[PDB]
Motif scaffolding. Structure first.
Motif, mmCIF file in Angstrom:
data_model
loop_
_atom_site.group_PDB
_atom_site.id
_atom_site.type_symbol
_atom_site.label_atom_id
_atom_site.label_comp_id
_atom_site.label_asym_id
_atom_site.label_seq_id
_atom_site.Cartn_x
_atom_site.Cartn_y
_atom_site.Cartn_z
ATOM 1 N N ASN A 54 0.876 -1.181 0.000
ATOM 2 C CA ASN A 54 0.000 0.000 0.000
ATOM 3 C C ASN A 54 0.910 1.227 0.000
ATOM 4 O O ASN A 54 1.771 1.344 -0.888
ATOM 5 C CB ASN A 54 -0.999 -0.080 1.149
ATOM 6 N N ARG A 55 0.772 2.146 0.952
ATOM 7 C CA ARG A 55 1.582 3.354 1.013
ATOM 8 C C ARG A 55 2.803 3.207 1.920
ATOM 9 O O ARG A 55 3.258 4.203 2.494
ATOM 10 C CB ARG A 55 0.719 4.526 1.475
ATOM 11 N N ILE A 74 -7.087 -6.050 2.586
ATOM 12 C CA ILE A 74 -6.536 -6.348 1.272
ATOM 13 C C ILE A 74 -5.078 -5.914 1.227
ATOM 14 O O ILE A 74 -4.650 -5.003 1.938
ATOM 15 C CB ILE A 74 -7.345 -5.674 0.142
ATOM 16 N N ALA A 76 -1.797 -4.887 -1.391
ATOM 17 C CA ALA A 76 -1.393 -4.378 -2.702
ATOM 18 C C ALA A 76 0.120 -4.176 -2.673
ATOM 19 O O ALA A 76 0.623 -3.315 -1.946
ATOM 20 C CB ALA A 76 -2.135 -3.089 -3.042
ATOM 21 N N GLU A 84 9.568 -1.548 -14.697
ATOM 22 C CA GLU A 84 8.309 -0.814 -14.629
ATOM 23 C C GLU A 84 7.550 -1.168 -13.355
ATOM 24 O O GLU A 84 8.052 -1.929 -12.521
ATOM 25 C CB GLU A 84 7.457 -1.084 -15.870
ATOM 26 N N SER A 85 6.346 -0.621 -13.189
ATOM 27 C CA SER A 85 5.632 -0.737 -11.925
ATOM 28 C C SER A 85 4.286 -1.409 -12.149
ATOM 29 O O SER A 85 3.539 -1.029 -13.056
ATOM 30 C CB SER A 85 5.432 0.636 -11.273
ATOM 31 N N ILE A 86 3.988 -2.402 -11.313
ATOM 32 C CA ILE A 86 2.752 -3.174 -11.376
ATOM 33 C C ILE A 86 2.203 -3.317 -9.963
ATOM 34 O O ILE A 86 2.966 -3.495 -9.009
ATOM 35 C CB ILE A 86 2.982 -4.564 -12.017
ATOM 36 N N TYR A 87 0.885 -3.230 -9.823
ATOM 37 C CA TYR A 87 0.217 -3.520 -8.562
ATOM 38 C C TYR A 87 -0.430 -4.898 -8.616
ATOM 39 O O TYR A 87 -0.782 -5.410 -9.682
ATOM 40 C CB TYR A 87 -0.841 -2.463 -8.234
ATOM 41 N N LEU A 89 -3.131 -7.719 -6.104
ATOM 42 C CA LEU A 89 -4.289 -7.628 -5.218
ATOM 43 C C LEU A 89 -4.753 -9.022 -4.825
ATOM 44 O O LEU A 89 -5.109 -9.823 -5.696
ATOM 45 C CB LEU A 89 -5.417 -6.851 -5.904
#
Lengths: 91, 300, 300, 300, 90, 87
Positions: A54-55, A74, A76, A84-87, A89
């Motif tokens: 998350n943050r 949840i 993330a 590169e950047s991927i999230y 879940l």
């Protein structure tokens, strides 16, 4: 290398260790993933380096475990697979 | 003197037709359809009415019968276009702007339930933007409580002026009969798809190159936000239009060309309507800060 | 100030009554009926409500109770007539002209669903001239989408002025409950049959001497004809009035009393209604040539 | 230009909410509710929706989510009251006088069938004061033919002004789907019980001290009486206020506060609603002789 | 005698021949009707003589076979049971 | 002891006998009620004294039989459990 199963059920079948990025930034490197495991289901792959939840920012297995001990709803992972950047879940 | 819907249904009913299909062990099926072009005999119908057909017939409500040919079909949006062979003295429907609809407007459903013949029922618009029924790839359904049963698929949903606002597609029925929950494809998307099928013979789907999931209040309580409706961005495929535009993961799309989104499937269907090569406006919120982004569409 | 059906329903509801049948393992059945003569206590109901009754009771919506006798009945049209013993302070219905109905007119169904009591529901006229359901000998039904369930048989279908336009007679449903497809006998046929039962006690049925099939778009393609709806005569029995008129095998019946015929079942029912000895004029089509043929009916 | 319910629905829809319940094998239930006080977040709902919850959540039609706490409940009347924790910018409904309703008035049902989301359907008032359904102890239901399905309990029944006239409670369905028969608690009873729950936390029920049965046309035909609707009293419990008033066995109760009684159940519910210690007027009919009786209510 | 099934599956159960009418007109005299057969179910009877298929005249079994080799959507048989005209739908 | 079954099945299980009330008025004192019998279901109790049938006043078992031979629609008994008075 502690098995990720003990930290949380969602990361079953993933081998996590304290590794490094290309640029030296600390992160948790995924070592081996069981095919068909929930880790494989969520999209975790070989040689992935998770960065933040998350943050937040996790630099060790202990840091990730301390973050996850509160058991949030949840998860993330900002993750890092390639330049590169991927999230991701899962519950 | 007494109020009625009879004066307006007299001019409109000839435009709705019955579709009879045979094929294969052989099968026979029945559905409805709407005449869209009278001079060229173009008929809009559902795609699962026609799927395994080897012969297709059209029947007008006065008794006349014609042979039909499939011009094109869309399995994702479930829309098929047929052509009548040697048309003669046909009537066509007018189409209304379904973007101006509201919950509480009155609606009439015209179809052919259970093979009885042409039938008209009445109701109201119950909901808008319905999706998530696991029916088709694209869902932006209008919900209505006019009685809709087997054989009504492909038929007409009209307003009080007799203009097309939907194409009847699905129902929700615990026991195989109408309980008052029916779904229709809005007429703007249907018109655009029919025009594409007429012009090219098949559809050109444009894609944003963004993979994401539905936004909720649960996620908003995990990222300290206020908005609970929209689309959550997770993956930006390499070299896509949004990748060149600068859209990064973790963002939330709120408005498309200034029109606020109520779902992610809504945005999916809106983008699938768009032709490749068009420039679109995205209202974005990243790290709690709003932005406006211009995006070039790709080709599927 | 607000629109409602309450002012007209306040005057009409006392005329619709509940019918309780005790018969023989014994059974107890329930239905409705309409009072048509307040001074004599005549009540119109369905034939299958009264079919095997041993005792019949009548209940008003204010609670009063009466005993009833059967004056007569008609199995083919499914209409029965009862008389109340010692009637007092009754209200009767007014009968409308059902030949002026159109698809899209508003209708109200009043009955006694599931033994709950007097209940009113609302809808539109979905279709006219429906048959082929294999319910009775004669079918010229009105199709409506008001909620109609078990116990509504014999009850009233009314227009917005409060006049009787039909007697509820049937339904279609996979699960046994209403899905919005209900059928009614039109009021003209019911009024004619009730008058016959009052005057004589039995129905006077007329026939043409024509045996035939239902015209389709296929038979019109094998004789190279134009009209696709009507009746196809295949047998003209010897000695009948039609033989004296000049009807031969193979021609097509198009009009009855100048009114175009939508089906063969409609022609059959409208002829069966008419009194023997009457003279009718048939619009005939033979060898692609139109004619008018005057026929005197005989008795069944 | 075109008539619609959209202008009036746009103002009242935010006041109807969906209620999600988790309880215990774990189960999840869904229902509806109505906001009756925006400043405090008071929500009226059904008792069997909330029955076995451990957690309750409220979701608005714009997507916001809140936690709720039970304030009180009434099992006999099946009415529950909740409070929204930390409300912000809510809309509340206006209540109408349900004692002015008539058969034929138009109604709109707003709810949440099958978990799809907020839905609106339309119909008319079919009957008043229905009972004998053996669902709750006290039944004085409004019957309606708007489409009401699973998930609609607790939601709103409104008139054409957007004012609450009932709370949707039950249906009569042969096969688990709507056939056009739904029941609602009138808003006068609901508002009285809600005020009692807010002020005290529980219901204060008053009783007469009379044991009796429903009047019929058969009992009246044995005592040579004219009326056939009301209450027949068989036992007067000693020490009650009614006994002090002089009400004896064999009397007929005709009117309460000058208003006609159509059944024993209506009198039961009306007495139960009235607060203990209040005085009521009874129209007694003993030995065919009318009397006026003042009764002081006791505590149940 | 000729087999009627070979002419068409519809006329199964009929025994045929090239015959003559009462006035001498050539026709197709039905000679045997099988009970329960499609011919009996349609309504064919004994001594019946077919003088038509749809809008034509058939003078012999060969001509009716030639007309029915086209396999039309339906058949319309004038027959002549009695001194009259009865149509059939096949 | 008069059995009530052939008098009326609705009073089955109730023992009937000609008695008198506390003031000397005539009536039928219910000697015994069998538990689970129709009499117990209808509400009859031991020592009950039926003193009325519908509106009419009755005094003896023969009068009961004569009244109920017609088999009326409903019988509203008056009765008198205690010093008060319908079924």
């Amino acid at each position: 290398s502690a098995s990720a199963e003990m930290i949380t059920p969602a990361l079953e079948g993933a081998t996590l260790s304290d590794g490094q990025l290309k640029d030296g930034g600390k992160g948790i490197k995924i070592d081996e993933v069981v095919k068909g495991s929930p880790a494989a289901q969520a999209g975790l792959q070989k040689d992935d380096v998770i960065i933040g939840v998350n943050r937040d920012r996790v630099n060790s297995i202990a840091e990730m475990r301390k973050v996850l001990a509160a058991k949030p709803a949840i998860i993330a992972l900002q993750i890092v697979r390639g330049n590169e950047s991927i999230y991701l879940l899962m519950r």
